[PDB]
Amino acid sequence: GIVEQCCTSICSLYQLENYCN
Amino acid sequence: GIVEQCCTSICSLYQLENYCN
Amino acid sequence: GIVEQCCTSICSLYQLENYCN
Amino acid sequence: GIVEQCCTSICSLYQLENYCN
Amino acid sequence: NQHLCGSHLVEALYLVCGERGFFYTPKT
Amino acid sequence: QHLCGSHLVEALYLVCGERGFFYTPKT
Amino acid sequence: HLCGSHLVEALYLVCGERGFFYT
Amino acid sequence: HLCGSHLVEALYLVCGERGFFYT
Amino acid sequence: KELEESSFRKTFEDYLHNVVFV
Amino acid sequence: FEDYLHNVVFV
Amino acid sequence: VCPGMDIRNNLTRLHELENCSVIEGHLQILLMFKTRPEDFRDLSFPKLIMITDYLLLFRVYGLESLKDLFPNLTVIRGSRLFFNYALVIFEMVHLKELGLYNLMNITRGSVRIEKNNELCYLATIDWSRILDSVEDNYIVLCKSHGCTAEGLCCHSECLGNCSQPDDPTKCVACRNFYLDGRCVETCPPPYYHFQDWRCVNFSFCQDLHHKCKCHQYVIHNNKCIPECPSGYTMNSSNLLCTPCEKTIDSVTSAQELRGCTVINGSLIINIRGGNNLAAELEANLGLIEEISGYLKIRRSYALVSLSFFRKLRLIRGETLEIGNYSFYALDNQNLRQLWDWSKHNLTITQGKLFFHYNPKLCLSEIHKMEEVSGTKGRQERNDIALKTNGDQASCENELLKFSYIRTSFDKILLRWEPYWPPDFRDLLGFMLFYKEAPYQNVVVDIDPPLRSNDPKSQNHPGWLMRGLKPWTQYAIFVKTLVTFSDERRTYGAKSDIIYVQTDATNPSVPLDPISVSNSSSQIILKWKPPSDPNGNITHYLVFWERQAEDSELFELDYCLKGLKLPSREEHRPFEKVVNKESLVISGLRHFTGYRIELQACNQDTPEERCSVAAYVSARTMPEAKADDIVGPVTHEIFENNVVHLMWQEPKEPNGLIVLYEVSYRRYGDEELHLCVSRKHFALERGCRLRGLSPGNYSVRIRATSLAGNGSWTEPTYFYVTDYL
Amino acid sequence: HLYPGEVCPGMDIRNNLTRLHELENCSVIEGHLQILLMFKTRPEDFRDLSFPKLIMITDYLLLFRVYGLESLKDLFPNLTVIRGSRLFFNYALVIFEMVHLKELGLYNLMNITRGSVRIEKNNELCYLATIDWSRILDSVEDNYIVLNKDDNEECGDICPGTQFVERCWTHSHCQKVCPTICKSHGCTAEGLCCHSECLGNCSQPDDPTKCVACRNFYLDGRCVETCPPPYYHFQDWRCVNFSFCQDLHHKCKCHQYVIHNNKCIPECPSGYTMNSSNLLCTPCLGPCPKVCHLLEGEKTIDSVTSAQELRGCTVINGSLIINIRGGNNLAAELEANLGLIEEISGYLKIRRSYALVSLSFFRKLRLIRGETLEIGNYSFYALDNQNLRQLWDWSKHNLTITQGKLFFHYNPKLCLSEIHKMEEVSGTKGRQERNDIALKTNGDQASCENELLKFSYIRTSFDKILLRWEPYWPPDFRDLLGFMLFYKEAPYQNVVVDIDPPLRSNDPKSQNHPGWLMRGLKPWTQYAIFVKTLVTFSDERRTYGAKSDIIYVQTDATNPSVPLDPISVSNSSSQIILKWKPPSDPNGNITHYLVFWERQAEDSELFELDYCLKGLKLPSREEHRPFEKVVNKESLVISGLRHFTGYRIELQACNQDTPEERCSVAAYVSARTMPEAKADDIVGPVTHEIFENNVVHLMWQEPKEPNGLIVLYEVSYRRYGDEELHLCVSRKHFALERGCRLRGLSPGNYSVRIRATSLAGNGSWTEPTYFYVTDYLD
């Protein structure tokens, strides 16, 4: 999920704002 | 309500005119 | 003649029926 | 022509029968 | 993003309702 | 031409049949 | 590539307040 | 790969009689 | 062998945040 | 030359 | 009994654990950066006795010990695990001790304790009392039934502690199961094993199933389960697991619906192209049988039929398309077919049929669908467009029939019946279609023939094909080409898809004849089939022939420097290599170039139709002692000491012998040299030396061949007259 | 005189000498000669074989494997000039692998005007050194005389006179050497120079009618310098009138002869069009004209390569057949090959031609003669042409169709309006009868929207565009099935959503304008957008409906994306080249790139760590900030910076600066400048203070401006006698001891150098500082 997006690949805030509320 | 109609799905004006008076 | 019709180009039977009797 | 077929590459008789009459 | 989604919904409903106006509740 | 004409008589044997055909192959 | 506890503090940086729900 | 003057006799063996025309 | 154990703890913390954050 | 020799001769 | 909860960032939601004695679930209190130890001084829930799944703690500040919050928690069942942990305590800042002195047995799972910078009393806890397996634990950076205060063992369905020993109603917790104030070993009927810790009747599971009318609860294996196990279908009366809108525009849109059977909703279809159409779509979607709602197909371009909905035998139409349609079809251009209405039966319960602008689906399929669907008398004016649908399919109600078929190998004469419309002006042409088909899992326009008459007129239009790969099955069918009438249009004919194979004809050159002479008499000739195998190749017709050595090599003086030597009807020995594309050939001379011809026959007994020739040429290996010299070394010394040498030649050489070499040296001299060629040996009958030095010489003689050197003879001893 | 015999063309006599007898009366080979591959000829065939009538060959000679041929002195003793009008790879003579050929013997060979001589593998060929080719060739450099009998010296090349050498061709024929004033015109037997339009030899000297051959040109028994009018320079050796060129042009009615540059030419030179009256190559009116006479007067066009043959055609003497059904670069390569065509003699066939939509890419095609008719006497054909929506812009493309009719069948996207336009423009309108044109299979699936839809209001957000437009209603408004908005992206103007019908229900003043918002859009992007009505085909005269205009709406110069790749390279102790890319969504004409930067001070814990402890592993590295609006530049070097200090930098992009700056979201980057060298090198004196108990207190001024900060200090003390011993001074140790303090050490003289160690590295040792404590005995 977030590790497959933000850790294996690179996230922006926008890919991290999906992991907000 | 409006998020289940106009945000998750797509509204027209007619689905938004329900959210008028 | 027939080589210019049936060999260089393509004949039907109808172009070959000219080469009948 | 024949050098590009029979000399650079390899001909059979059939590629050489084109160089007959 | 419901915020961005609802961001136009007031611009929608202001164009939709106009002089009628609209009651709009975004949160949850 | 040799392969090309070789069928033409097979063709013209079917095309003419009992009519038959005159066939000059040379050049 | 924010990884390990680096992504954890990157999340609490991006979230700040309430952050992530369970419904 | 028949090349040089060997191709000439490789041809005339295939040619034999009349060989090659000019029409 | 110690890098089979390294990746093991790491599998988790891979699996740690995938189950938490919606 | 002899490349171009037989390319022009044999039809 | 309280569910599993995740209390987050504040302890206000922890007060919802007020009257809770069982967490039916897990607990996760986490990321409380704002909690302080003042928040935990007046905060306790000793009512909690059992948690079914696990506990997780992560960065709750202010929390220092768990002896206040939950002093009477005893058993985590480990019903669900957190990567085999029933307990993860991770980065618990301010947490100094666990303090859980009533912790007695973890049934399932392990304990992860990490980065808890203040956490002590970790060595003081016997986890082996608590865990049946302490091996997977991670602490870094009265068997199980327990005892009361005097140490008397509890009931055998207690687990860890009991208010009164040996009483299943005076257990603190249950070892396996719970029913009605009592730790039960099993849930007896009618009670179902509910959540693997308790026992509930039908009505409980029933009414929660109806509240989820959410995991609508079902029943199997004496258990109120959320969902039926494998191969099982719920029985809607008694929940018994008995053995058995969405737009679709792409394959991935079907991969979500992969495996669907009954659809509680409608579907929308605008797939317009892609690879593996109707096949992935059947594999996802032929499985569907029932649809509650309607069905939409709009603008759906590249497909042609819906037969890949194999099981789809129900439209309820509960969701109707506007106009009260349970079906929709618009702009579906290449669609020629709904279904094989002789095969696929389909129920459409509600609604009508929207058939518009779908120009390849004939009305016959439509009236078939009217009859099979049971919707026939439902459709009114302009539910179905007549002039935009199947109007470009031509709907050939008749068949064209072939009157004669001749095949050559690349050529197939077809003869067939001339079709004529009743106004035969309208016959625009005839449209033969074909392609290649080695299976039967399945274009030429021809003009009209000469009408002109019919006493007995072969105005059969005929057709020869030409460029064909011979011995190849061809799915072929004709269509009429006519005009759309201004009246009730004559629909024309089209011929049947006939599967004609071209002729087991002379096949192509059998590919790659690789001739490897792996011995002095063995040559593995191997090859591939012909590129046009053109028939079931019976045998591969191998011809071979020995090529003798060249004539000029027998008559060259190889004693001359410039001796640069290459170190290499009639019936021939032949082989019909039946069903084999390799051949080793035996009975061969050593070191002799051979010429080999390969053909392939797909025909042997009647008048062998074999391939054209594949030539290859190779030389066997030499023998070793073919070149080694046989026979004696004879010296003949004259009076004038003109010494004539004689020797038997290597009678069977490796091919031939080009020259001979003789080594002569005195005790006293060195090896001097003189050569013996073929004609020099044949004329001198050996060799001839003329007049040399006194002192003893010795002679060894080598043969030199095309293959190489045949070994030196034995040292031959003789003396000429010293004369003094 | 000059040429008593006929003029004969170029010939290739092959495998037998029977065809050589066709050179009987020939005096000029108007062409070349190639006698070759005569494996069956014998020297008996060449003993009774001669053609001395031949005087000139225009192009060249080639000989190859003619057996039996031994010398050329018999076959052509009087051949004099090869013009070299055509060359065989710059050879006017190739003699190659001539078996049995022993000598050339061509003693009348005098001048080759153009070309060279290739003599190779002629295993018997001698008298090759006896020939002065420099007499014969104006350039003997490109000659190729090798691999002969002449090279490996065995030729008994005896001239009749049995380095400077005598010249011959045989044992019995010398090489005739004329005086130098007889330049190329040659000489007669007594050596008098010939006429200046003779070339090589003359029967009588100084007479252009008694030349043997002409130097440049020939007219009427006389070697002329030029062809005077009306004679045209015919084949660059003679002079012919109009009627000769004319009638050979009519015999080729083959190189139908034309006329330019006082020459009867086969074909006109560049930019020129023949004038059919007088064959005159007149300039065309850019591209060059190209009449493409086809094989069997027809050609099927099914592919791009089928058009590449017809690339450049203008007038087609024939018909064309078209069944291209798909491929890349359609109608564009097809215009580039085929828009150039203007005229067609025959008909035009288009059958089954699938993927194209229009014929407007036939830009110049303004004539169908229809001379070849399709059966039924059609000059035009259209069948099964499915995606075709258009013949031509009949407001633009005008087209003549002379003969024949129009076959319009099963072509379901071409409306009848184009058809009646074609009827009117083509002039074929009253020709077509019943069922020449199908009414119900053609354009029946194009819907032919005779009206326009009109937009009533457009709102754009950046990713979102509200359209409002007029509700269309058919007169039977049941039939309104929908509204079909089409769109795409178009940064040029070189050019799908279905919407339901709105609520009819009323019309006092009803906004039953159906409206549409788009959503996912790249902001600041031009969009070619048009609506279509969706209605029903009527059972009656069908209401054709409307479609809106292709409107080109740009989304909004909105906050642009992150300006990509901010690469911050600190190329000095005060310079940092921050470079970056534009944002992925630049979302407007980016006015400036809004660079913010900030100095990040050194970390606080580094000031209060004892770096004398082993474990000293040291990393060797509203409010308004100093900012920069980098207008029209995607790089920035920043000056005025401290040495060795980590900085934080923020990048934004603004496409809006003056009204209420709409700038990008931030692009952060952080970097540290280079150190200075002598920032860390210690300033101020090394002071020793030695007590009575020899507790020696050291003092020094610190490196006031370091490379960031100073973590520790290092002091080197060694006696004359001892070695360097060690003791550390940290930050607090320096700050508390005010320097250093040593306690009680050995007599004999010490010396002190002091190093600074920083985050960047070491600041150099101080100067060796000399002092002695009380020895108390001496």
Numbering used by the authors:
A (entry chain Q), B (entry chain U), C (entry chain S), D (entry chain O): 1 to 21
E (entry chain V): 3 to 30
F (entry chain T): 4 to 30
G (entry chain R), H (entry chain P): 5 to 27
I (entry chain N): 694 to 715
J (entry chain M): 705 to 715
K (entry chain A): 7 to 147, 196 to 267, 274 to 304, 318 to 515, 531 to 656, 754 to 909
L (entry chain B): 1 to 162, 177 to 267, 274 to 515, 531 to 656, 754 to 910
What does the paper behind this entry write?
In the current studies, a novel class of insulin dimers is described that function as insulin receptor partial agonists (IRPA). To explore a structural basis by which the binding of IRPA to the IR might elucidate partial agonism and biased signaling pharmacology, single particle cryo-EM studies were conducted in the presence of RHI or IRPA to examine the structure of IR-extracellular domain (IR-ECD). The partial agonism of IRPA derives from differences from insulin in IRPA binding to the insulin receptor, differences in receptor mediated ligand endocytosis, and selectivity or bias in downstream signal transduction.
In contrast to those fully activated receptors, the IRPA-3 complex, which acts as a partial agonist, engaged an α-CT helix and the L1 domain (IR site 1) with one insulin monomer and interacted with the Fn-III(I) domain (IR site 2 as defined earlier) with the second insulin monomer. In contrast, region 1 spanning residues 344-349 and 372-376 (L2 domain) exhibited protection only in RHI and IRPA-9 (full agonist) bound IR-ECD but was largely diminished in the IRPA-3 (partial agonist) bound state. Hence, H/D protection at region 2 (α-CT helix) was detected in all three HDX-MS comparisons but no protection was observed at region 1 (L2 domain) for IRPA-3 bound IR-ECD. Furthermore, cryo-EM and HDX-MS analysis indicate that the presence of the second insulin monomer in IRPA prevents the receptor from being fully activated.
